[PDB]
Design a protein around this ligand. Structure first.
Ligand code: SF4
Ligand code: SF4
Lengths: 119, 77, 232, 180, 116, 60, 78
């Protein structure tokens, strides 16, 4: 229910307005991300153990720090509004990744003719 | 309806490949009665809609197989 | 400042301007800047391999850049990822185009170069498509595609899928054929134009040139055998 | 995870008030910022022009500038081109067509020598590769024929063109050949 | 984020559906013929356009594979796209129309004797 | 109308004299009644760019 | 409903240094739909340097982008 993906008509840095409450919206997005991906596809896959662990790491640094600036210098991304914008779409990415199940075997073997260039 | 199919059996008679207008029963088939091509079927459909100056949708072009259907859609204006 | 250019204050200099010595350009290294980055990038490719093992084929690393081989029926789920992951925040595409090698039964490899913004890191992604069968576009993900894939279609006839306005841009509007296929040569089939008798109808003919492109058919013994390098 | 890309510092920059105190209405109201540009172009009006009366004067012609393909010969020149075909194999529009033969006196000479001045890009690779330095880009822009038939330079045009001037070409090479 | 005359690219599977789709394409491509003669000001008549369009589709009546018929459908609908407005010009447009004979003079009567 | 109010104003500015202290009052009332029409038309007359959207984006 | 017309923007000299054939549609002199149309100048360098050598390739290669010449030389050389 977090409608603070991106705001409207305020003046932040690069053509994307400033969200009002970035910490509660972001911690709700991390909670929803952990609720979706963990309960859909198995913990065997490296993809879950990567997205999940990075998600918990970001969750830790958000839930610890207070201002919207120290969280930047620890998060390794750009602006915190843009951190929220980034943090939106992996929820929908894992949500799509429910479908087209990638942790299965490789569905196609090319003929090995296709991957020959020279020598 | 009356003498609309007079115009239609004038246009289709003016159209070629139908050597027998006596074989043109009005209430009759296109591809069974006269051996019209499925391409030529919608060709004469576009000829019919161009004669009456009227424009048809796609499904109305889909359903036409005999000219009684054609006259029945001509009746819509 | 002052004293710059004309209407002169009579002050100038073209003297004593030297550094006279003998050069000392001590270097031999062809490509050693990249080896730490290549060792990082192998491991990055191993991450992409283990993360999405269904849809990917073998990676291929070369000289500080990266190329992912992808089965062609499934590109859209790959590029929902890898454009738009947290750990792979690329979000900026720089090239989609095609390359024929008419050696193999599949004929046109289709090559994508993508660009990161947060990470300053390029990537390449390839499919293989035949003149017969299409591969889907990537215009569903972003809007920078629908011009480039027109360019790909016009230069090759690599037909696409799931795409609005697949027109021609890069040729004449009545011109069939596809130029960057190595089928038809430089002259083209019909390329003349003249307009005298049937007035102003600049209509083509059989393109008979005035001197043919006398080719280059020389080749020496053998170029080189590569000094390989991998991290592992 | 450091991942050092950050710090655009996003200046909030309200900038509501205190730009001016009715001076703003003056500069907006009458065109002071725009009268400034008029004063600039009037001050530019007084200064020097830059026209070069082209029939009577000429722009700067560097010695490495490219021209019309005059064939040099030696001192007491035996037609210095040897049809060595190196100037063929790099003309990037294939505007070179040569044919050669053993001439009567034993050496090899050009039977015909052909430059499509229709399609000479003036890359100078002909000059950069003819080893005896026999085809040379001129500096002369002496052109503007009315037919293509007055452009297709055969051997006689190029030998004539080198015979018309080698003075200029000697100046050119003697400022360039220790750099070529 | 736009079109010009709603060019869509989505090849169906079944050959019947491709048949119907090429049929509706033929209807629009035939209906636009007086619009073509208006737009380009040809000498010949609208029935010349119609018999040559019929000729062009009878050139590929007997093509087997639907996975060839797909890109033939794309070529057809795409050249309809480039004909329904003024992208093509009449010098570009006469490349479909070997109209006149008198350009050629006397020529090959398709005999071996007059190859020589 | 803003032409032919100038046509209305033109005889008054021809003989500004012979109507002193009073033609001033009448034409001031005329210009008041016209300037309120100007303050009507200042509020509306401009083109409008049809397509420029900005609404915030929401998720479930 | 919308009934919009179209224009052709530049045959020869609308924007200088560009054969800018822009098929542009307007309703209220508003560009509701924009369809750039370029490609008039498809000189086909992309084909031509497949039969030329690398030394031969470069004077093709700054004929692309003819206002920044030796930078394009430099990107090919890199
Ligand atoms: S100057 Fe360049 S284009 Fe001209 S003949 Fe020499 S190499 Fe060819
Ligand atoms: S490069 Fe020299 S030897 Fe070769 S054809 Fe040209 S002038 Fe003759």
């Amino acid at each position: 229910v977090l409608v603070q993906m991106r705001e409207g008509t305020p003046i932040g840095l690069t053509g994307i307005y400033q969200h009002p409450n970035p910490r509660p919206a972001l911690i709700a997005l991390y909670e929803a991300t952990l609720k979706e991906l963990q309960d859909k596809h198995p913990k065997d896959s490296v993809y879950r153990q990567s997205i999940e662990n990075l998600t918990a790491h970001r969750k830790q640094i958000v839930e610890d720090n207070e201002v919207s600036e120290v969280i930047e210098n620890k998060i390794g991304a750009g602006l915190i509004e843009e951190v929220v914008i980034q943090a939106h779409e992996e929820l929908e990415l894992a949500k799509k990744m429910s479908e087209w199940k990638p942790w299965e075997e490789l569905e196609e073997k090319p003929l090995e003719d296709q991957w020959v260039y020279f020598n | 309806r009356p003498d609309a199919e007079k115009r239609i059996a004038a246009v289709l008679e003016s159209f070629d490949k139908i050597s027998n207008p006596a074989a043109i029963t009005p209430t009759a088939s296109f591809a069974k009665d006269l051996n019209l091509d499925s391409l030529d079927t919608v060709e004469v459909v576009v000829a019919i809609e161009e004669e009456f100056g009227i424009e048809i949708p796609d499904k109305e072009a889909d359903e036409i197989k005999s000219v009684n259907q054609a006259v029945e859609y001509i009746l819509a204006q | 400042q002052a004293a710059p250019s004309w209407e002169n204050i009579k002050d100038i200099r073209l003297d004593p301007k030297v550094h006279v010595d003998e050069v000392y350009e001590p270097i031999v290294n062809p490509a050693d800047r990249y080896l730490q980055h290549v060792s990082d990038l192998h491991q990055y490719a191993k991450y992409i391999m283990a993360a999405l093992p269904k849809y990917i084929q073998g990676f291929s690393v070369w000289k500080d850049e990266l190329t992912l081989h992808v089965a062609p029926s499934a590109v859209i789920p790959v590029t929902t990822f890898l454009r738009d992951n947290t750990s792979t925040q690329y979000k900026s595409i720089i090239d989609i185009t095609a390359v024929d090698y008419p050696s193999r039964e599949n004929r046109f490899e289709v090559v994508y170069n993508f660009l990161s913004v947060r990470h300053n890191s390029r990537i390449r992604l390839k499919t293989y498509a035949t003149e017969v069968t299409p591969v889907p576009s990537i215009t569903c993900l972003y809007e920078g595609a629908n011009w480039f894939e027109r360019e790909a279609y016009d230069m090759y006839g690599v037909f696409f899928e799931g795409h609005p306005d697949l027109r021609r841009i890069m040729t004449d509007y009545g011109f069939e054929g596809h130029p960057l296929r190595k089928d038809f040569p430089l002259t083209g089939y019909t390329e003349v134009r003249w307009d005298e008798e049937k007035r102003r109808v600049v209509y083509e003919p059989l393109e008979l040139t005035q001197a043919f492109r006398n080719f280059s058919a020389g080749s020496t013994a053998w170029e080189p055998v590569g000094p390989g390098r991998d991290d592992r | 995870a450091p991942p050092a890309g950050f710090r655009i510092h996003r200046p909030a920059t309200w900038e509501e008030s205190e730009e001016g105190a009715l001076s703003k209405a003056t500069k907006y109201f009458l065109l002071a910022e725009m009268f400034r540009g008029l004063y600039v172009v009037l001050e530019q009006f007084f200064r020097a022009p830059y026209t070069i009366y082209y029939p009577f004067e000429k722009g700067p012609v560097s010695p490495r500038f490219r021209g019309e393909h005059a064939l040099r010969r030696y001192p007491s020149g035996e037609e210095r081109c040897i049809a060595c075909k190196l100037c063929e194999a790099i003309c990037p529009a294939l505007a070179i067509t040569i044919d050669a033969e053993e001439r009567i006196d034993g050496s090899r000479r050009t039977t015909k020598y052909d430059i499509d001045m229709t399609k000479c890009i003036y890359c100078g690779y002909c000059q950069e590769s003819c080893p005896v330095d026999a085809i040379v880009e001129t500096p002369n822009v002496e052109y503007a024929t009315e037919t293509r038939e007055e452009l297709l330079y055969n051997k006689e045009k190029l030998l004539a063109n080198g015979d018309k001037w080698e003075l200029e070409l000697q100046y050119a090479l003697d400022a360039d050949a220790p750099y070529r | 984020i736009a079109t010009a005359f709603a060019e869509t690219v989505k090849f169906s599977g079944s050959k019947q559906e491709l048949q119907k789709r090429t049929l509706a394409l033929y209807r629009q491509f035939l209906r636009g013929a007086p619009t073509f003669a208006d737009l380009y000001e040809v000498q010949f008549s609208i029935p010349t356009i119609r018999t040559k369009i019929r000729q062009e589709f009878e050139r590929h009546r007997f093509v087997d594979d639907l996975s060839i018929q797909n890109v033939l459908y794309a070529k057809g609908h795409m050249e309809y796209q480039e004909c329904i407005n003024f992208w093509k010009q009449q010098a570009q447009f006469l490349k479909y129309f070997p109209e006149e004979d008198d350009i050629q003079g006397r020529h090959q009567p398709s005999n071996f004797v007059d190859k020589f | 109308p803003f032409d032919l109010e100038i046509s209305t104003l033109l005889p008054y500015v021809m003989s500004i004299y012979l109507v002193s202290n009073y033609g001033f009052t009448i034409v001031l009332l005329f210009l008041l009644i016209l300037i309120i029409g100007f303050v009507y038309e200042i509020n509306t007359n401009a083109l409008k760019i049809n397509k420029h959207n900005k609404p915030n984006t929401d998720s479930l | 409903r919308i009934r919009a017309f179209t224009i052709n923007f530049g045959p020869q000299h609308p924007a200088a240094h560009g054969v800018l054939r822009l098929i542009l549609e307007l309703s209220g002199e508003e560009i509701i739909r924009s369809d750039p149309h370029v490609g008039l100048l498809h000189r086909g360098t992309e084909k031509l340097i497949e039969y030329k050598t690398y030394m031969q390739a470069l004077p093709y290669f700054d004929r692309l982008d003819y206002v920044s010449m030796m930078t394009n030389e430099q990107v090919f050389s890199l």
